[model samples]
Target: KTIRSRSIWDDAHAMLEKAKAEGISTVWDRAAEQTPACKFGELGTCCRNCIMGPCRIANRKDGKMRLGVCGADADVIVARNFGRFIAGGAAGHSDHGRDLIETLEAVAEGKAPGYTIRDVAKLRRIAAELGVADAATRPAHDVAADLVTICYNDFGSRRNALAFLARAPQVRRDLWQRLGMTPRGVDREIAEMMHRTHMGCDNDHTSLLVHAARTALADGWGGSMIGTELSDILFGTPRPRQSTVNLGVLRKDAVNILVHGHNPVVSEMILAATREPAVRQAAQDAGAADINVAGLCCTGNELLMRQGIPMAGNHLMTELAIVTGAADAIVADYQCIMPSLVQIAACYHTRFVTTSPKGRFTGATHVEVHPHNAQERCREIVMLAIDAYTRRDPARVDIPSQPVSIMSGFSNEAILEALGGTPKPLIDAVVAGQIRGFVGIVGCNNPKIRQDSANVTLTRELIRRDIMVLATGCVTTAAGKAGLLVPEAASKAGEGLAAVCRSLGVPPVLHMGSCVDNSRILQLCALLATTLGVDISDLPVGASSPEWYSEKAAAIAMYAVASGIPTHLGLPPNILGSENVTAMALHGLQDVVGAAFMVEPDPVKAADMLEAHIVARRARLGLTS
Candidate 1:
């Protein structure tokens, strides 16, 4: 199954067989059970927004059910559902960003117990960019408070444009304004999307889609960007580092504490707790070698980026990681975390803990963490895990193969620093045709796409063609496990890209942080555009989320297109029922936004589509393909 099943890892395959023998159901089983999904829902033609009716416009020429209860056509119904779909994703990431702001605000007021500006340089740079007065000269905390004011304003009721939108090229900004896709405020756009999707409000498909793009813009540019940058400021900006990956990262003789979910606040505290002398004494007294803390999702990405923490798994591995019977504890915060983990942990002596009230799971222990109480609460959580480790049954334990090595922590700042303090070196490589193009492989795993199969294949295919890959989200674990996240993996890439990778001592594929850090790619594209005095649409870059399944991935793809980057997906969204909506996503969007989405299930073909776009853009830039 390691060779034939969804994943390419021996660790994951061994655990799946163990789980099946134990009567434990994984995400694959659930995805199989839900096979032949609801046709109406899959088509985005079903709506219950106002409850006037749970409507469905099942395409029929026999004159039955062609329109919804409100006389809404297929286009409007699909658009409204999609608008709400994109809005749902934006809300999660943006709300996560909002909490980080409050954390910074709490730190500024000296209310946060263990929080402080770790990167004073980044704090000053960001403040000055946001127009904070005398950022470099002002006290760090004072500047942080001013930056907090600016970030909070981005979430407020009034704003003509987000502060960071200034990073975009002027021509791109002008086009967004002309299309009415300029994001105003993160929360404001989300609220307006809900308002427009109401029963009798927005009836035009195009209008709804434009607003959808705006809401997603709030995510990619405003909310997500804030989360990534502010995280770097509070917890030091990530530098290039090495780590291990896969379920093999779990230690058999250690107290394994898996930090799951998306936020860095809880996981960072957990990492800090694991380092305390008292906590180390507790673990040692429990007869464990050490306390091994690993990441599961974006939180894993966060810790992997900055602290070089080992990763246990990704979106589909949460339950399987627990199934190992070696995970003494799984501490989760929010987003992409499965509630099934709680029940799975109950099957063993493992302690399943929830940190955020917003991400509570029934029958699981809750130790709600805040900026004020994170230090103490996180310490207590580790103690509970140590206790669980004492109760872990040895007979049921099944440790897999050894952990695979991978390198991480490629933030935009880190990338710039590696290029000798400027993007000019990178630009020179592109111009000299030593690097043919770039592709950002961002988003999650879909049970529908055989887990990481598509992701790993598409990554190899792209870099093999001299297209340097920028990976994030669940794809990080996939690439790292495939041995593509280390410098030596460049041997499999095209000659040009391998040469550049060897020169920098970096992998052909760079781990560019988490999902929210896709904003970093957006920043890079805009920087390159500005440097060359061109629009981002003119850059030889593309994006692909070949195995995407989540609403957040959908929103990210939309914003990539709206920001003038061609995007590829393995499976089509639920918007396929309406020809107009599908056309806009596939073709019409290119005419308006200068980029569009292409659905190609085959990874090799998907690579062709992406590379073709890059080639066209390279030709436009007068660079040989």
Candidate 2:
């Protein structure tokens, strides 16, 4: 009945209302039930790392419950909790990178039947950058093996700094070295984070926080970078492409299979299976016109960037997509997949298929996919969707709204190619204040906030101020639904940004890629800094995640700050219990790292904070409007 309050999209609102009438539950309903969250948990003052005692530090007027059984105070407890949080996030992305490495390694060995190097040019370039001997002249497979060795070594303990850390400016690299924040190895740092956060290990709040930065830096410059680059080599880099978004992308006449999760490994093969002539014939024989594949969450972003696949929805839209009664199957891999989807799929004829062992749902069909068997398994998965389509209840089907047109696939390579083979044009615009600065609006959606409200508003406010927005993850769907992903949306931007967008035939808000692809934004910043012979902290740039709730989002924000980009979040993390930890996060770190966190629940106020950081950086760089 009050569906409109839950989301900004008519597609979402309509499906939500349909769900209510059907007496179905969703993420919002569950969030409501979980309301009045525990104050100690919210404040990051609860410790369960050991069995001595389940501790909760409370600061009452009586000064009671101030310490844990281990005599740990609020600051110590909060910092340790926050450290492990960052580690969890880093593990997700780093593990993804490891998977990509394994896939590329299989392809290199010719053990993967259907997977081959898609972008050999990127392969040679990246291989050469990593100092693979005779990379440009060697066989592609030979070069790939060498690149794999280097990437794997990043996950090992032998490296003094991650290979990709070389991309950061010299000054920034030196600063990291001085502060002992240089990420030596992905697994090493994460393992160290776990060890340090263990009970009776690292007790200093400041020490724990610094190590957290190190762990997150490992993700941004190491694991995630490898994932993005290797993905390009394996499945062609993204270029400008037109697509549609929202629940309207779901088709009643076709076997609608939605790919969800983070890794492109499974989704790419699933898309390939849907396109096979045999597969189309199978769908047609089953009374469906064709096999139509759409995307959800990061996996959908992956396909949207490269294959120009229409997006069914973002995070909040997942269960609602099933509610539309058109999603024949949800083929998932791992990360950001809510377990609620399994129960929701059970309510309909939708086949809830888990492709990765890491993302298995209890009641869902598990079609485990790997580099060697993905082609065979994905075809089988597509057939399952076709079978499910025949059982669809016609009376329950309800697709809402016409699909919105959005242009996606804007990798850094695509951006430079459009700018005439250099970042100079963009730099010129920034120097002239035609594009005042840039902010990568990257993160997940939290049910605690109205879906996409903060994300969309922040994107609009930034573009209106001539700040170019680089979007990833769920923000891509929100901005696309808001009609800000097309070049024509330049009309709504500020005069300077409008002029630049009109000239370039691009939207003011560029769709970068999935969550791991935030590494693309990091690369762009490093490129601009290196070209200008300045530290990245000196660039007029910022980052924001208006409605984030995942540990991955925290790691992304932490890495962005550690890299000298001020980041804003709409909600505070669980560190508010300790004034020292909170201050170090919000302000004290700014003095040390040249960037810090900004917590503002209001999108408008968050915009001001991001804008102010950009302005100050611009002034420091001797640029003006």
Candidate 3:
């Protein structure tokens, strides 16, 4: 039988075909046999929130369209559900940003130990731009303190906007203000989103979308931006280096410490402890090789970007790594962590250690980490890893040899310098039309699909078509693993893009940073806006999440749209249950933010749609051929 579909789905079918030809029992084969007709439930329909209703909304020919006693229609319930999901994501991102800002303040005041301003040059550059560099001449402490205070105030300040907000093109900022979607403050935006989504509040789709834009902008331009900048200042800007991925990266004979979480505070301390001779010797004494550390999820990204620590893959890779019987201890801080980890680790010799005050699971080792005592707490966790290593059953181990060589650490700042040997090369590229535009391919991994396949396929296609691709989150690491971030990958690109990559001596796709560093993409967009003299809304650029499965991805998507970039989502949000909501998201909202969400299931179609959008915008702005 012939299947009609895009290249991504075709590739998926081909994989299944190969398995069938070989007479192998595959996951797809098993799924196909037990497939159920009620796929709407998988999309999160059947809501039984209250006694008044256990509503189920599905496509029907009769058009009965039933609502509960609460009088909530399919659209209202779906919108509320999606709004809550996006809000949860926004809260997580904003909270993470808040914690990082507090950390930056502590470091600036010398209150945080075992940490210092590692990238003073970047700090000076940012301070000068913000007009705080001259204050450094007065007193070193005063300048550091002042900069940190200003960053903190920017999140909650109603009178003044974030200093970095000005980095975006002036026209883009004007567009945001004109829409009344410009976030006054981070907390305010988040609070208003919650308020609007409440029962009998802002039930209208347009009003809810307005708040959505504001909340998303707050995340991308406000909270998330603060996190990325401060992290760069503290950990030092990431430089390119070799790393490994997958379960095999875990060391069997060493103190197999897995740092898994979003926060860098605990992980940075762990990084320091891994380098200590005592920790190394302790691992050896525990019948191990050495102190080996691998990162999971955003923790991996943070350490990978800075120290080039080998990543063991993202969220889904966590349990599989533990199942390998290699990880002695999985130390996690906050966000994207599975609570089921405690039960999973209990099945193995691995110690599930929780470090953050906010992230504690019952039966897991809780070591509350404070800023002042971060180093001590890290050492304590390292000791647990060493202890767990001694208890591993050599006979039960089944670690697969699947590590891939990756070259990581391509930051936005580095890209600017690499492209033109100055910050101005990007401007020239846009003007010259050698590169069509830029696209940020980011988001989480979904088990429903093949691992990293969407990210890899979408990114490769974009790069081949002469679109400058910047990536963050786990999606970026997937590209790195595929060796797409290396200059050699440029050979696979189209002649035009390959030539640009060759001249620049960098990969066609730039690895900006971790999931939180999506803000870096926003910053670069803003830079293009200010330097290139175009409204960001008018720029021939787009962003996408080809295989996202997290609330964070939704928040990122919303924020991208609010920032004036039309974002494409491969897997439609759960709110697609309602046709009106889908229509509003995909078409109607363009009038408000100059951008809209596009639902594209096929990778090739998604890429083409994105390219068309960029071209149309360029043509509208009179920048086309």
Candidate 4:
């Protein structure tokens, strides 16, 4: 019964009970073991940057231990810590972007087999947009090489702005420049943030926060944008597709391979391997019917978007998915993957395979996959899964409830195509109050919160208020499991939004890809703002990460706020120890940037807060309702 409170899904409940009976400690157990989280650490008051007194800003009645030995007060300490937090997040997404660039460079040079320009039209258009010479007329590889140079330059310090910053409206760009928040380079801003937060450097809390926005902007407009776009170029751009979700996607009669993490470079090739006749025949020879490939997290989202792969679970469900004992293998790339998965997989017949050099677990079977070697290595990895399937104990296998249908792959291109290749119909819906506003509920599930409870509730509440949702990250699975990712879900929305959904044949909540693909939401917002000849803040659009638990989520929130989109979080970051820093994050940034962070744990109240912001923006834009 207690397990029921752990998640909103029956699949999770069944697996949690299974894990409990088997004495397997999951994320929830670890979270309980570390209960009453360290006050100083949680409050962001502890600073151990230097050997001089590992410090905590005291909140005593008397002034004792209020400052560090270096005389840095709480505000400075908090801001510095938060700045580094954003830097870590920025570096993660930016590094993923850099990897994509290198892969494309390899593909362009004809060194990467089985990876070709899948979307040549997008390649030429992107090249032309970036001012590559004769982009439309040149050989595709030549154009790709030039585009690669431009993307690489965005990582360098020479550029005054990122290549993709052009996607944002001029007015928003002006606002960013005026506030000194324009991200000039991906690595440049990330490195500067690290330097700024270092001891005895850039101690002004306000200044540190501003640069945090700049560093995060580099991710949203630079690194993450590149990752999303290049993934489309290397793989195919996502079009609307049907898929399934939940642990039920796991197969007991076949070899089940779960691709975890964020990158598609490895997962796509693995999917191809599973479909190969040789691999399929091998699996059948091992007494399995077929090889089933499912997704676990963002990499799953990547495959789900491009290839319509069924999703197994999300951030919190990784361990529970393995607990089903049907998962023969987990091929991971990088990011949002839990190390605990290795421990859990060891308790089963699962072969925990690590693909990326950056994401090696100590006990994992490493098959480092590069673009040049992916096709060969991925085939070998699939064979390993088939070998593991031979050892799966049938008595231990217990797949959860049947998978629910989901409609995914809502890229901005797909959305615009659905709108007749223009934003006019969607804009008209908003203006006519058929759709009151938009919100992108992009976030990760935290063990601190009931898994997917807030995510699903907030999504339901928003659509009920006639606000169409653009979902990404783990929320994609939450919405999918709740049966909200199909056009039939329009029946649950308010009449106006329901009618609009029925007209367009889309769900009330559109699945917009993975965490990094939040850039799609950014692009959609920019498109709306530019079409209306106003700033992004002028649009009736908001963002919320109701159940977030990652530094990358914070970076995404920061960039959204910096881009003039009001954002909400279910929990506060570790800045409450410094009222100055906390106030600046919640309010002061709004005064300067036109948007701020709204922290609310209650899903209903968070929806109300987000809807209120949309209402105000609608009024400001002189639109109805």
Candidate 5:
């Protein structure tokens, strides 16, 4: 008798076999099979600017020879498209950091409510590094002023490098400086790229590619890094946490408010307000039994890492959460927000409330959550959610019970602590040869394939082969939902990986953080360089986005290439239509940056390529089998 499959793996493998029997090619088959009937571009496409072009660039050949009326070639179009993605992504992250800095400033001045310096030790350490530790002992407002000045200076300090750059190994900093690609300032790099890419400023593929690296690095190492560190300073670094995923986390008897988007300031405040006795009483007064709060997308990851809040899902599940008719309020800040939410909100009592000043959308209630009045704004938003809960149409509600247990909050520090006791490090495991090498399996969940399909299959295969897997973004969320983010799951990993996991007391796979947290991987590499006294170029590591579908991913791939990391992309880069351009980027880039991109769609082949790449890097570093 044929076995019934309940999990994604069994179903995916069975479907793969069926497809092979039906003469269907198995290119990215695991993703396709797991995401059967889903369009690859639905969760991946981005076109809010103009009706003239929705701009869907999924398949390698879809827009190869085609161009807009402007006579632009494929490479130019792809480069611009890729650049804009980083621009938007970087803007989102940097703007979020700016808002957080403002909040920090307010807290220092006693102007921001429900906020205080929670991690004074970290603050002192950071201040000491900046030569301002004594400032914290002075008047709070004075200290706040100085800290804010330093934070603001990070964006445009002409004389000194950003303080966070100091976190990277000195060698990495020297390399960035030598290449003349160290970001001048966060805003400067992003603006410069946008200006250079405008109509006809800098159209050479090589020149455009250079700006791509610089701009993306600015986001990873600058703005996003600031956001992560500052959030930790205010909220404390994340420790291990238990959480649940899927729509089942939405309470039918309680008022459900989904905090969606990237930054933590808004969500952090909302989380506080949700627990206030007044807020809970307000919800009780509004006819809701209780209040249930969860997160979606990067904001979800942010809260998940810190507070252990249940993650509703990532980018693809936004509308589905509303479709469940379970959420009373979907409070969003910025980035990855669909304006279609307005229309979706119109379909139900699910109020789509835009909180950030920059992210107001038509049809959504705009509360204008400023950093200064963060707590007040949070209370106002929560009250609106409570009010909406009273208006819920019980007859229309279609709540689904689809929650899954997940273990998240796997920090880089935690990874080290887990590999050995406090004394032993991950390098010790590597030296023991229990694990072959490391692979950063990151990127978004593309609806073009199956949900969580590519992330799950590829990660499992990698860990099964003794490859250390580090994941971020939707891929991390998917793995978490599958229970692959816990140490218990390490038992299923290969002998080498399982032993390492058991030794470290961590899951075989590590969930570093969100998409922006890919910077953490770069930092981890730099740390290895500092400890082992080797160049990052000589590390036994490889990175890939097996189901990647964003311009940010392209920007990231470019930066990784520039940083000398052999990066593989499971999906084809759009420039592949121009073989010459592809060859130049893939083959020629090595001479320029010590690394290049390889595109492989087949999962097994992709896994093999990754394994081979790691082995080759290990051999080069003299750390091989």
Candidate 6:
């Protein structure tokens, strides 16, 4: 049996007990089954990049088998592995962004049926920024066409740097150029990473690490930035909104459809389908009162940002979400989705529906939705949800606790608007020490760490120290459930932060959006630096990905450091096997990019490290540390 005390949330604990009582296996159970992992793999010293040999290097006096088939050492092997790890992560984000670009193109050509540019101001601004012709005066379609072309070009091999890299301060841009870390193209860098990792190529660990930086930078500035921006344009940018969170958000009287995975494109469609008159009536016809949609992971954050949708849970909770018995259909897209959900859903009437071809599980209902047919495919999926609701065993259903209230939708534009159309007020607050500094507490829930335990603790620790947190991804749900996302929670903060929070009626911790929305935080930092006429490295800001478990999180940390944000992670990556590679990541990169990575499992110390950097930056800015 699993320990209920492992999770910080009562709801998760309740679900864990419930699943245990029902004999349903969860991530915790599986995690226990996979006891101690392979030491060589964990150290990142194992190499199978070619057919000659799957080699491992050892720390030995004999100096035997120290090199792989191609005579590569630990540093080279570790660096190559880390590069490919980053490349896969970058590809996921970049490809997701590419899909959005294609959707925009289809809309521009009047091909995507239900898709329309919802934020025209953002469209014109992006078009103007990208050097589109007559952006302010041009038709929306024409502007979008030009923007689409520009976006596609970032994926190609033609650019010297990503178009959005222009947002960084000139000094930072020059520094990136000098270090040869400026990302040229998303696909190009990923392809280069794969090529360099091959058996006989790019054996220099330093060169491999540099290309890893380039690949990760493309994801942040090029792919993720575009995804966040265009998602706002296509789905209407998230402003300040109210929502509910936790497993309690799952409805017992309704056809509870849990939207899992990361993509907002499909989840947005799933939400729209649930609201349809036909789907709603079908749910009622099946003896259900409503067709309720709740979000999980980044998908939950995405819909919660725009549509004020209730969140069910985050990463580890994906399996337990099905065990709730009320969940009828779990509609999924891509990334961070465990295949175990397929088996777990089989234990109940839950219809495990996979939407993307890239993210498929055996025995899932494959209802692929393209831009041209998403409107219909989504409606069909919602109907499937209603049908599955009828099969729900009420005897097995148990809702956890009351849904917690949260304040969502704090986009960069929203923050600026809250500050009355300028960042000057926020800057002044920082200067006055009322708002000491900003730290983006972003990342995921790892079973390795107590689920959301470090996340919530670090957030509170930071805010109580007067370091206001900007949250995204799983941290959003963690902060929300911890009451840090609500205005009244300001009492838990330091005097200065509490005063500022009370005056604005906002939380000390701001919910920035999803994991992809970390790019929004980057945009905010760039804006502040540009306004102050300084490099991003000059800002009193830091990033923490506490309890992170995905390759995407590592890529995010890499890009943040590459962009000059000192980053904190709860666990070190497998690169620790090589002191040279680890030192480069943890200490050496600070000299190159003005920031580096710090790994601290304890949230208190991690917050200290992050706040210390923020304090140093503030002191450098002629403000109180």
Predicted structure 3, TM vs. truth:
0.89
| Model 4: ten consecutive residues of lowest lDDT | 1-10
Q: What TM-scores do the predictions have?
A: 0.99, 0.99, 0.89, 0.99, 0.85, 0.99
Residue lDDT tens for model 4, 57-167:
988898799999999999999999999999999888998999999999999999998889999999998889889999999999999999999999999989889999998
Candidate that would win on lDDT: 2
189-236 per-residue lDDT for model 6 (tens digits): 999999999988999999999889999999999889999998988899
In model 3, which residue pairs have backbone atoms overlapping below 3 Å?
168-526, 253-289
lDDT (0 to 1) per candidate: 0.92, 0.94, 0.76, 0.94, 0.72, 0.90
- What ranking emerges by lDDT with the best candidate at the front? 2, 4, 1, 6, 3, 5
Where is model 3 poorest over a 10-residue stretch in terms of lDDT?
A: 2-11
- Local accuracy of candidate 5 as per-residue lDDT tens digits, 1-625: 1212222433234433443443433324334576543342332223222345544434455545254334455566556655676676677677877876887888877877788877766666556666675855765456656767777887874734666777666676787787666776778788988887666566676667767777867777778777776777777777777788776788888999999888788888898999999899988887778889998888888888889999877665666667666789999888778776677667778888898768879878888787678889889999989888888888756555567777777766555555444424567667777888888887675645555666777788888889888887777667876778888988889998897778657787777777777777877887787777777777777788877776667666766676667787777754544454577667877776667888876666777887887787778767755
Which stretches of model 2 miss by more than 4 angstroms? Answer: none
How big is the positional error of residue 490 in model 2, measured in Å on the Cα after superposition? 0.5
TM-score of 5: 0.85
Residue 354 accuracy (lDDT) in model 6: 92
lDDT of 2 by residue, 289-312 (tens): 888899999999999999999998
Clash pairs for candidate 2:
none
Model 4 residue 186 lDDT score: 98
Clashes of 4: 1
Candidate 4 deviant stretches above 4 angstroms: none
Of the pair 4 and 6, which is ahead by TM-score?
A: 4
